[PDB]
RNA sequence: CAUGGGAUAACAAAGGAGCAGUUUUAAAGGUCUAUUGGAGAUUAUGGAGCUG
RNA sequence: AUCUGCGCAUGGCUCAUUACAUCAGACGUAAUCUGCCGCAAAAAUCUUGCGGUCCGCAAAAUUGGAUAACUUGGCGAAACGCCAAGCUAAUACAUGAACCAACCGGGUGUCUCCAGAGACGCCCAGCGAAUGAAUGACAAAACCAAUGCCUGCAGUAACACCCAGCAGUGUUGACUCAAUUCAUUCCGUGCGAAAGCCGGCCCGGCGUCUUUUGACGAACAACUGCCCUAUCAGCUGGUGAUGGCCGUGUAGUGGACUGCCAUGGCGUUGACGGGAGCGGGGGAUUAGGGUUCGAUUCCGGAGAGGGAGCCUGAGAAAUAGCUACCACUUCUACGGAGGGCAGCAGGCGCGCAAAUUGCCCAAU
């Protein structure tokens, strides 16, 4: 139950760190798709 | 090059047989971060209390060392927020406010002038004269009679 | 016993308060510790909740911190130098919070030779000393009493409450405050 | 340390008659508040008539036959309160504690799929040791890794069998609540406007299905769905609609005359 | 505690010499953040404000 | 029968005290303690066995000493009094778990590399606690050094491999808080997997340390309110009265308290002192305005013959707990030993004035 509780941290940390990744790569798209335009 | 040249003693605030310092932050940091340092020079602890009260110009850019102060200490303002008028400022760093109210008598269909006086701790951010209207906020006991602490002064 | 109530205090009108209950246990106070210098002897006190509050009698050592360097070292208290409450507490050498003491200064010099490499040569491989030491400089009033042998320091813990004599080294204007009052 | 209740100082929603004994079963600390629960001796004896007295009532409970939120409760003084799910495997009935529109506790009958989830309102959020952010709930639960969009006023759907927070309901303008305190307790309404007033009590303005406008403190509202049609949990038979006192008085006389 | 209505009254301050020019335009002198791939250290130009 | 674990701090009685007190409505605790109960958490600890004298091979850790009851001998007029010896338990007391079994971090010495990078080695790295430091957000180009991708700069999370997104993001109206990083060290005043108990035919019911928070509470603070009295006009302040500075003490805030400094604070809007006596919910009467009563069932406060002071416990300044004195007081074999009905029945007094030394846990 310490391994299972340290497993449910490692997948809460992929819920947090993926949501931060999806915001990195919607902004570096929307910056680069207007940098092409000008 | 090895020597640091620390700050000299500011004798205008240092009167009180122990060194007057703020417990929140250390005055003696060499490369103190931009967290607590104010505009001109020195390290200072200033806090934002709750209910839409703007901290004064002093308590950010002042030099005074106050404990029991709502803006520069661990004193938290909570509970009641009241108003009074300044009655006497004769005590050191403490004022007595006067709260004047009309007490309605249900039998004689008429009001009655009563008053309550409260000892209120007054920060050196503020200099209220007699008759000035203040806003006080409740805090912990700070003395035998001090429960409130001045938040804003409305002049004259 | 000793109580902490306002039942015995006069009203602000000057009137006497007439007492209509016995003393409560929930309003007690206890006799002071009067912690002095000496070899360590402590007596625990059973507080509320069953918690233990360790009275310090006779303390000689503590962890003192050098806050610019963000380190601490277990050093030995030498003397009690200045107390803001009374000069009589200096003479009986009571340890309270905020009293000014002198400490050993030997672990601080040894740390300042091990870290920054300045004495008051052997690892030629690791000169991460050079990665530090350039921006940082040391106050002169510290380095004088550091090599003089004892450093003035300030007690930052409450010994009668915690049974510890932890502290901080006086720096800056705070050292220059207390050096004037002594000499 | 109080250990007794007088039956007059007991809550009125329990509906214990004043002439039957001096004392009422004081609910222990636990999940729900003493003022805001219905202890299991009152459910097994006074609500359901499975027990004629308190002596028959502990023959049921101490034997392990009543389950509050999937776990057998052998305490007659266990505080069961709002959104709890009370199962009984032998009689095959399972109920949910809801407030009806007159403010009293009501036992809403459930299916098997509707009896697995309960809806729980966050009361506090903090970080525990480690860096684990846990969520404190009105039922006393401490969910350790909730949905990261959890704020304090929200509602977590929980599924008490597999202890996994399956869903989240934020507290916003467009949601529907149930009122769990005050004069308006048991009423269901859409949220209209939430008046903040920092330092004091948040006031929440609410509009009912009929259009009746009413307000409460926002610590009294309990959001239970996205709208008044898409409620996440089933509600009692009035469905939060408070009829007029004149119209509901006429209908009982009409129903009693038409019955004879 | 929240909120809106502004009749009547109230607190406060004043005692009227005891008093509180707005914009376009180019010019002079002088004061203590954002970009150049990052971060560190120097460095002139410039924005907006300073006054004659 | 006795060890052990909880309980006896509730309930019940009474209303003597008591006017910046209690109490009511309403707030505060970010100034704090909190057993039982609810949902959770948990990677610290070189221990055993066998062989050899500190090492080797092993592994379901087959741990240690003492007391009751009891027996024996008893002391004493007695006492809800006692002694000595001999036995024996644990979920009492004490001791103690390597490897299975992680991630992550700091400080640091040899070794393969390049003109700083890696491998290895050592010390330290658990929850809680102390002190110190760091987080706990924010609201146009030019040149040199180190460094990033390009074949001069297109475009870009951060990071020298192990994991190319394994936290760049706690909460509040507000925190010096929640939590995390590192520095030092906790010497009993913390941390077992009870070295625990059952049950089913590996699994399931319990029972327990620590840690943490909801809940039931505790303690403090005070916004508005309160009978009569001036044949009571000044009250407080050396020996704390109002405030300020270091401390101390507390569970915590604080003249609560030591030291020092200042000269305040309250009052004809009735202070101060005296008399009446628990405070509300409420009762009686009332067109309206009122005038009265509230010892009494519910809530709160206080007390247990008066007055203290304590122990134990999560909680008592407890009284069907202890210690002492004062006033009464019972047994004695005179050596001594005890008492506490404002619990329920009763008893004597006192008065105008108030019942049964009853049956039962069937209900609450
Ligand atoms: N007045 C109460 C306070 O007493 C304090 O001082 C008091 C003490 O110095 C002293 O009180 C002592 C006390 O220390 C000691 N531990 C116990 C003793 N019973 C008390 O004595 C006091 O009480 C008894 C009975 O009332 C009287 O007989 C005695 O004369 C009186 N001095 O006497 C003073 C009271 O008269 C402070 N002066 C002050 O805080 C305040 O006056
Ligand atoms: Mg026992
Ligand atoms: Mg009365
Ligand atoms: Mg203080
Ligand atoms: Mg009572
Ligand atoms: Mg007497
Ligand atoms: Mg009787």
Automatic annotation (TrEMBL), chain C:
Gene Ontology molecular function, alphabetical: structural constituent of ribosome
GO biological process: translation
Record's GO cellular component terms: ribonucleoprotein complex; ribosome
CDD domains in the cross-refs: Ribosomal_S8e_like
Presence of keyword Ribonucleoprotein: yes
The entry's keywords: Ribonucleoprotein, Ribosomal protein
Glycoprotein in keyword set: no
Pfam families: Ribosomal_S8e (PF01201)
PANTHER family: 40S RIBOSOMAL PROTEIN S8
Family indicated by similarity: Belongs to the eukaryotic ribosomal protein eS8 family.
Name of the protein this chain belongs to: 40S ribosomal protein S8
Organism name: Leishmania donovani
TrEMBL record, chain D:
UniProt xrefs under Pfam families: 40S_S4_C (PF16121), KOW (PF00467), Ribosomal_S4e (PF00900), RS4NT (PF08071), S4 (PF01479)
Domain RNA-binding S4: 40-86
Domain annotation Small ribosomal subunit protein eS4 C-terminal: ranges: 208-255
Tagged with keyword Kinase: no
Keywords: Ribonucleoprotein, Ribosomal protein, RNA-binding, rRNA-binding
CDD domains, A to Z: KOW_RPS4
Domain Small ribosomal subunit protein eS4 N-terminal: 2-35
Stretches assigned to the Small ribosomal subunit protein eS4 central region domain: 91-164
Entry-linked PROSITE patterns: S4
Annotated KOW domain residues: 174-195
GO biological process, one term: translation
GO cellular component: cytosolic small ribosomal subunit
Keyword presence, Ribonucleoprotein: yes
InterPro entries: KOW (IPR005824), Rib_uL2_dom2 (IPR014722), Ribosomal_eS4 (IPR000876), Ribosomal_eS4_C (IPR032277), Ribosomal_eS4_central_region (IPR013845), Ribosomal_eS4_central_sf (IPR038237), Ribosomal_eS4_KOW (IPR041982), Ribosomal_eS4_N (IPR013843)
Signal peptide boundaries: none
Gene Ontology MF annotations: rRNA binding; structural constituent of ribosome
Family, similarity comment: Belongs to the eukaryotic ribosomal protein eS4 family.
Designated name of the protein: 40S ribosomal protein S4
Species whose genome carries this gene: Leishmania donovani
């Amino acid at each position: 139950k310490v391994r299972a509780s340290a497993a449910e941290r490692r997948e809460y940390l992929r819920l947090i760190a993926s949501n931060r990744r999806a915001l990195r790569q919607r902004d570096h798209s929307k910056k680069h798709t207007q940098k092409v335009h000008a | 090059p090895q020597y640091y040249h620390a700050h000299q003693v500011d004798a205008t605030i240092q009167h009180q047989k122990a060194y007057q310092r703020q417990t929140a932050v250390n005055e003696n940091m060499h490369r103190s971060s931009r967290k607590h340092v104010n505009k001109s020079g020195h390290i200072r602890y200033a806090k934002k209390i709750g209910l839409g009260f703007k901290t004064p110009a002093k308590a950010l850019n002042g030099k005074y060392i106050d404990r029991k102060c709502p803006f520069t200490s661990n004193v938290v303002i909570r509970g009641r927020i009241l108003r009074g008028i300044v009655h006497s400022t004769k005590m050191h760093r403490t004022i007595v406010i006067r709260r004047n109210y009309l007490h309605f008598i249900k039998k004689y269909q008429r009001y009655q002038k009563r008053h309550k006086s409260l000892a209120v701790h007054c920060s050196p951010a503020f200099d209220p004269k007699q008759g000035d209207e203040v806003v006080v906020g409740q805090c912990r006991p700070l003395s035998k009679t001090i429960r409130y602490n001045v938040l804003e002064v409305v002049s004259k | 016993g000793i109580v902490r109530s306002r039942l015995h205090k006069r009203k602000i009108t000057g009137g006497k308060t007439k007492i209509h209950r016995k003393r409560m246990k929930a309003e007690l106070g206890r006799l002071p510790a009067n912690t002095r210098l000496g070899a360590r002897r402590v007596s625990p006190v059973r507080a509320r909740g069953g918690n233990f509050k360790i009275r310090a009698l006779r303390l000689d050592t503590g962890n003192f911190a050098w806050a610019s360097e963000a380190i601490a070292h277990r050093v030995r208290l030498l003397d009690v130098v200045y107390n803001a409450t009374s000069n009589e507490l200096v003479r009986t050498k009571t340890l309270v919070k905020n009293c000014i003491v002198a400490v050993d200064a030997a672990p601080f010099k040894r740390w300042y030779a091990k870290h920054y490499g300045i004495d008051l040569a052997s690892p030629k491989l690791q000169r991460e000393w050079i990665r530090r030491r350039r921006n940082h400089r040391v106050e002169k009033a510290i380095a004088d009493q550091l090599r003089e042998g004892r450093v003035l320091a300030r007690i930052t813990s409450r010994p009668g409450q915690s049974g510890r004599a932890d502290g901080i080294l006086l720096e800056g204007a705070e050292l220059q405050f207390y050096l004037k009052r002594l000499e | 340390a109080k250990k007794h209740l007088k039956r007059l100082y007991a809550p009125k929603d329990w509906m214990l008659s004043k002439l039957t004994g001096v004392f009422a079963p004081r609910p222990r600390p636990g999940p729900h508040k003493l003022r805001e629960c219905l202890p299991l001796l009152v459910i097994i004896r006074n609500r359901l008539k499975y027990a004629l007295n308190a002596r028959e009532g502990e023959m049921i409970l101490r034997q392990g036959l009543v389950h509050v939120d999937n776990h057998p409760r052998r305490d007659g003084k266990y505080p069961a309160g709002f959104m709890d799910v009370v199962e009984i495997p032998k009689t095959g009935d399972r109920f949910r504690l809801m407030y009806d529109v007159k403010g009293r506790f009501a036992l809403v009958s459930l299916s098997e799929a509707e009896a697995q989830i309960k809806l729980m309102k966050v009361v506090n959020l903090y970080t525990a040791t480690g860096r684990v952010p846990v969520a404190v709930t009105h039922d006393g639960h401490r969910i350790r890794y909730p949905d990261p969009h959890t704020s304090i006023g929200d509602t977590i759907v929980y599924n008490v069998k597999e202890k996994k927070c399956v869903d989240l309901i934020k507290n916003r303008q467009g949601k529907a609540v149930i009122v769990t305190g005050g004069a308006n307790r048991g009423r269901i309404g859409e949220i209209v406007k939430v008046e903040c007033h920092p330092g004091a009590f948040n006031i929440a303005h609410l509009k009912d299905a009929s259009g009746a406008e009413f307000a409460t403190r926002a610590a009294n509202i309990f959001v239970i769905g996205k709208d008044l049609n898409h409620l996440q949990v089933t509600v009692p038979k009035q469905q939060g609609l408070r009829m007029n006192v004149i119209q509901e008085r006429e209908e009982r006389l009409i129903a009693a005359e038409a019955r004879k």
